Write a protein that binds this ligand. Structure first.
Ligand code: ADP
Ligand code: ADP
Ligand code: MG
Ligand code: MG
Lengths: 222, 194
């Protein structure tokens, strides 16, 4: 079961190389954060206690060069354990068996190679254009806080032992590929965030520096 | 088992559908990129276009010799760049990049003249390749001609109307004029497509 994995993994490295502008992954994550915030905002207009777990409605992005991570946190509706498993799990899980079934299916169904490569640049899966691993921490009003992890081959989900630290919402943590180190650069992230947040109805911030000494804090990008 | 994995992927990549016509989209794309590099350069180097004053892409069909020519007056490539700039085959399988030409061609000949070198000819069948200084001298002025020796089954890409429709299809947003050598009611000249 090691050879199939070498073909699976390699197949992805080639398709990723077709994406010169991988920056779209950030547009997709912001779009999902926006959708989650709109959902809880809509709910709050009917239920006065819907925001009890976390009164703010924001998207906050932070870089961690030491750990080589990019965090995109929203205080949207969040996801229950089942949602992490059914929604993200089926989407991210493209291992040996999954990738082949989708291939033959695409083969039979008459799906163009173009239609295939395009699936790599849209939605949640687009995170893998720049990440070796994706970690999702989420808290939905109807469940406890959970952590989901995937390398695009397998995925696991376990209750967060830190308990409810998000209040409500989701953090998408990307363990970036070596060649995606550019997305750990403050100037690049601020530029891209500003680029894709022009239509979201909520404040988006990037953890940035400001200069008695250099202090870091949330900087409004839209 | 690298070659094995490579062979497997190649078999897989081609096990899916893809209109090989996308080769033209890729050639027009490359021509655009080359024209942009020299266009920009001309904004800082007053005489950069001295070798060839126009910024165009001209397509020619040679049914007789079974050849398709895509000539741009872009930046061109030096001898070193032809060897260097021209895995890649896998991407070509996906219908992307220079190597997508082999989807419709048995051999690709590239003639190029860069301001910093003499005109050269690069030839390949996707397995081996050769590069030699053009005996004809500087005939392009500046730029590149991609010459495709079309496969037997790709003979359809030599018909005027066919080529024209294809070019128009993949040149709408290109920042440069694309022409196709065509006849007019016993006249022949370049016809704009975008
Ligand atoms: N930040 C988030 N908060 C809540 N749910 C999310 C988030 N990101 C993704 N999801 C869930 O994952 C699902 C799939 O996301 P995606 O692949 O982008 O497809 P789409 O947005 O078209 O539904 C979303 O529909 C939603 O159910
Ligand atoms: N018409 C052309 N004029 C100058 N250079 C070209 C031309 N076509 C291809 N090249 C060179 O070949 C390289 C590889 O082309 P390609 O496989 O399409 O990849 P890409 O366009 O993404 O760089 C180009 O980057 C360029 O250096
Ligand atoms: Mg989405
Ligand atoms: Mg190209």
């Amino acid at each position: 079961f090691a050879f199939q994995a070498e073909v699976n993994r390699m197949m992805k490295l080639i398709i990723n190389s077709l994406y010169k502008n991988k920056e779209i992954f950030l547009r997709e994550l912001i779009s999902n954060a926006s959708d989650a915030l709109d959902k809880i905002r809509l709910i709050s207009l009917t239920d006065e206690n819907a925001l009890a777990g976390n009164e703010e409605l924001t998207v906050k992005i932070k870089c961690d060069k030491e750990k080589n991570l990019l965090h995109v946190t929203d205080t949207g509706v969040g996801m229950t354990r089942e949602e992490l498993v059914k929604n993200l799990g089926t989407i991210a899980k493209s291992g040996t068996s999954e990738f082949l079934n989708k291939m033959t299916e695409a083969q039979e169904d008459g799906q163009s190679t173009s239609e295939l490569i395009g699936q790599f640049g849209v939605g949640f899966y687009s995170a893998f254009l720049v990440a070796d691993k994706v970690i999702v921490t989420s808290k939905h009003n109807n469940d406890t806080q959970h952590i989901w992890e995937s390398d695009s081959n397998e995925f696991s989900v376990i209750a967060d032992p830190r308990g409810n630290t998000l209040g409500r919402g989701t953090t998408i943590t990307l363990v970036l590929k070596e060649e995606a180190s550019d997305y750990l650069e403050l100037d690049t992230i601020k530029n891209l965030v500003k680029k894709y947040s022009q239509f979201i109805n909520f404040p988006i911030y990037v953890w940035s520096s400001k200069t008695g000494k250099t202090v870091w804090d949330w900087e409004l990008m839209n």
